[PDB]
């Protein structure tokens, strides 16, 4: 199998590996990229992988050691790809790379190249999968761009700073985030200051995330006219599959729009 660290990385892998080999995801549904320790069975899946795909040591540090044990031919370290380095955006760089369509393309290309070498019998299928992935992703970018266009200029806060690549591509205008690392409590001072900004800068939304209890986000919204939504940067409800990555970007767009639209 192809073993991906995070579900949306699994979505990209599953576009390319469809009808070639299975895709497995290490980080379980409901867990955060910022808070994991590999279970004994996760370590086994990784050791037995045909190919491992992950962002890199500045993101999923919990897996740097076992990944380093694998042959180079059996890993894709997205953040270290020559195609990806020029696309990295400064936060020290933002490592939430799976929300960048262009980085997703570079990732798909790298997965394709690795699997063509490992599984030469599947060359035609891999080629067709990559072609299909790119066609679908282009369609999705057009659709998501259109959906988000009327929402540009509307202010909002996100729970943690995960969305920068996606927001930059589609022209969304967040005012800020409650947290950088969602494992760190923002503190009461920060919270009343966020409310002040939401009110003074006439923000539309605040967003919770399914991986974290929303009480803190709800507490800031209270007293104000700000609407509450939810963004899921890990696409928890979406199943792996050929069109899963496009489904994920479309779902994220819908989550923004559900709250931000008037
Ligand atoms: Zn994150």
From Swiss-Prot:
The biological processes this protein is annotated with in GO are: cell adhesion; zinc ion import across plasma membrane; zinc ion transport
Pfam families of this UniProt entry? ZnuA
The UniProt keywords, alphabetically, are: Disulfide bond, Ion transport, Metal-binding, Periplasm, Signal, Transport, Zinc, Zinc transport
Determine the domain of life of the protein's source: Bacteria
Q: Which InterPro entries match?
A: Bact_metal-bind_prot9 (IPR050492), Lipoprotein_PsaA-like (IPR006128), ZnuA (IPR035520), ZnuA-like (IPR006127)
**What compartments host this protein?**
Periplasm
Cystine bridges: which residues?
A: 205-259
Induced by what? Maximally induced 30 minutes under zinc-limiting conditions, still induced in stationary phase.
Q: Where does Zn(2+) bind?
A: 33-34, 96, 160
Molecular function GO terms recorded:
zinc ion binding
Keyword Metal-binding in the entry? The reply is yes
Gene Ontology terms: cellular component: ATP-binding cassette (ABC) transporter complex, substrate-binding subunit-containing; membrane; periplasmic space
Family, as annotated? Belongs to the bacterial solute-binding protein 9 family.
This chain's function reads: Part of the ATP-binding cassette (ABC) transport system ZnuABC involved in zinc import. Binds zinc with high affinity and specificity and delivers it to the membrane permease for translocation into the cytoplasm.
Q: Which PANTHER family match?
A: HIGH-AFFINITY ZINC UPTAKE SYSTEM PROTEIN ZNUA (PTHR42953:SF3), HIGH-AFFINITY ZINC UPTAKE SYSTEM PROTEIN ZNUA-RELATED (PTHR42953)
What is the name attached to this protein's record?
Answer: High-affinity zinc uptake system protein ZnuA
Q: Which gene encodes it?
A: znuA
């Amino acid at each position: 199998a192809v073993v991906a660290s995070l579900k949306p990385v699994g979505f990209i892998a599953s576009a390319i590996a469809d009808g070639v080999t299975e895709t497995e995801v290490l980080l379980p549904d409901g867990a955060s990229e910022h808070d994991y320790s590999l279970r004994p069975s996760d370590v086994k899946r990784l050791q037995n992988a045909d190919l491992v795909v992950w962002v890199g040591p500045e993101m999923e540090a919990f897996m740097q050691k076992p990944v380093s044990k694998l042959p180079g031919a059996k890993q894709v370290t997205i953040a270290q790809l020559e195609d990806v380095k020029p696309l990295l955006m400064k936060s020290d760089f933002n490592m939430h790379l799976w929300l960048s369509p262009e980085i997703a393309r570079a990732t798909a290309v790298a997965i394709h190249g690795k699997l063509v070498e490992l599984m030469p019998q599947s060359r035609a299928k891999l080629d067709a999968n990559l072609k299909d992935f790119e066609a679908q992703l282009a369609s999705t970018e057009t659709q998501v761009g259109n959906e988000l266009a009327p929402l540009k200029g509307k202010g909002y806060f996100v729970f943690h700073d995960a969305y920068g690549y996606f927001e930059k591509q589609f022209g969304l205008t967040p005012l800020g985030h409650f947290t950088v690392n969602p494992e760190i409590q923002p503190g009461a001072q920060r919270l009343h200051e966020i409310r002040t900004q939401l009110v003074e800068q006439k923000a539309t939304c605040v967003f919770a995330e399914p991986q974290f209890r929303p009480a803190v986000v709800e507490s800031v919204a209270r007293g104000t006219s700000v609407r509450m939504g939810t963004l899921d940067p890990l696409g928890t409800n979406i199943k792996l599959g050929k069109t899963s990555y496009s489904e994920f970007l479309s779902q994220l767009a819908n989550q923004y729009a559900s709250c931000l639209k008037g």
